[PDB]
């Protein structure tokens, strides 16, 4: 449990072994659990010394200790990672990546992962120094099983961070250089490797449809669905996020998701005990019901409309908001037959009960959905029956009360409905 001053005295000596001991003391000090002294170590000016030690090919232990210490420093605030980067650590770690000693290279992977995880700028800087080539060279083996578990996990997490963050998104050339190894890692059996790969794919699918197309062309959607059916939540969460991001794009990408068999999993996702899983699944359903009428009909065929009715009847308010969005998209883009089927599944009562809330946006969404349903009824000449139904459930009172809402669109919609169909 050395002091900062003792570590400084040791590192400033002209003895390689004394420097090694002081660097190990620094590592152990920065490895503590309760408030490691990162800021005090930075103020002592020890980062350049560790960076210099990184290059002592003749003394592997000092390389390892300085790498560990710099890793733990770069794991903190953006300012501390900036200190590490300003010390010149990126090229030294990239050089260490090719060390004959495996633990040194693993520590280099770890440090570069932290630096890239800082944000977009440091990610692009790590990429510019040329880390992707040696990193992927570490994984260029016939069978990933020959590599050590921790080594592979750290490599996967570092790559996931190299795929992470937006504004700007990762350079396209780097994504193309990384994607094959990411696909090979997405087929590995270790749960942590799988979760990190799914998070990387999630990051890469968040953005314009061209990035989504990059990912989908690699043919990873079936594996993403398979993992969506996984038992480990750490795997299902990123897989569900990736599938949702994929279906936020073109109708053909959403259709590739559907062909993979994703809908079959949603009965359990829309009833999943974890609120976030339910919310993400309902949002995915909302973006699927905004697609083609063929895709709406595929939502119907899989028996997912009753599950949406259920979510609308009882769920977290945010999941209920996503469900109202899904219903309004369904009604806007659906056939008269599909809107009728939706009514027969019992949407009117829950959708009305949700008009007594205090969120103006959902009130507008619901009134728009009801306008669409009334339009379909007019198409079939059943406007009066729908009116009787919205009455018996106690909705008419809700609409006539919304007529007195501060918002203008709520006022207009409530009135319009009352006067057109209820008078």
């Amino acid at each position: 449990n050395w002091s900062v001053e003792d570590i400084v005295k040791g590192i400033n000596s002209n003895n390689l072994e004394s420097q090694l001991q002081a660097t190990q003391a620094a590592r152990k000090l920065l490895s503590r659990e309760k408030q490691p002294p990162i800021d005090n170590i930075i103020r002592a000016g020890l980062i350049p010394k560790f960076v210099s030690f990184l290059g002592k090919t003749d003394c592997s232990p000092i390389q390892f200790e300085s790498a560990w210490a710099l890793t733990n420093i770069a794991s903190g605030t953006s300012e501390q990672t900036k200190a590490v980067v300003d010390g010149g650590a990126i090229p030294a770690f990239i050089s260490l990546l090719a060390s004959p000693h495996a633990h040194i290279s693993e520590q280099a992977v770890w440090a570069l992962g932290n630096i890239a995880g800082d944000g977009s700028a440091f990610r692009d800087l790590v990429i510019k120094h040329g880390a992707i080539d040696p990193l992927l060279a570490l994984l260029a083996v016939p069978d990933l099983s020959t590599l050590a578990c921790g080594y592979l996990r750290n490599l996967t997490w570092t790559l996931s961070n190299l795929c992470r963050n937006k504004n700007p998104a990762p350079p396209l050339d780097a994504v193309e250089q990384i994607l094959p190894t990411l696909v090979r890692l997405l087929h590995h059996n270790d749960p942590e490797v799988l979760a990190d790969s799914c998070w990387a794919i999630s990051y890469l699918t968040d953005g314009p449809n061209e990035r989504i197309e990059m990912v989908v062309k690699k043919g990873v959607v079936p594996q993403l669905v398979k993992l969506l059916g996984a038992t480990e939540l750490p795997i299902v969460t990123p897989a569900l996020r990736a599938i949702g991001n994929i279906v936020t794009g073109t109708d053909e990408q959403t259709q590739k998701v559907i062909d993979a068999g994703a809908l079959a999993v949603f009965p359990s996702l829309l009833t999943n005990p974890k609120t976030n899983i339910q919310k993400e699944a309902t949002w995915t359903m909302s973006n699927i019901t905004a697609g083609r009428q063929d895709q709406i009909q595929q939502v119907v065929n899989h028996g997912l409309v009753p599950f949406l009715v259920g979510v609308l009847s009882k769920a977290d308010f945010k999941t209920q908001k996503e469900a109202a969005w899904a219903i309004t998209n369904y009604t806007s883009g659906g056939t008269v037959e599909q809107i009728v089927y939706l009514v027969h599944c019992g949407i009117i009562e829950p959708l009305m009960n949700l008009l007594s809330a205090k969120d103006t946006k959902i009130i507008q969404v619901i009134l728009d959905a009801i306008s669409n349903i009334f339009q379909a009824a007019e198409k079939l000449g059943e406007t009066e029956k729908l009116s009787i139904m919205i009455e018996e459930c106690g909705g008419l009172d809700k609409i006539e009360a919304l007529q007195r809402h501060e918002n203008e669109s709520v006022y207009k919609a409530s009135l319009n409905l009352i006067e057109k169909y209820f008078s």
Binding site: S31, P36, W68, T71, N72, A74, S75, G76, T81, Q107, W110, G113, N114, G117, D118, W157, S160, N161, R164, A195, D196, W199, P238, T248, W283, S286, N287, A290, G291, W325
Partner: peptide, 12 residues
């Protein structure tokens, strides 16, 4: 249509 693993991690 409309629109996590720790970024940084310490050793020990």
């Amino acid at each position: 249509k409309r629109t996590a693993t720790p970024p940084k991690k310490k050793k020990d």
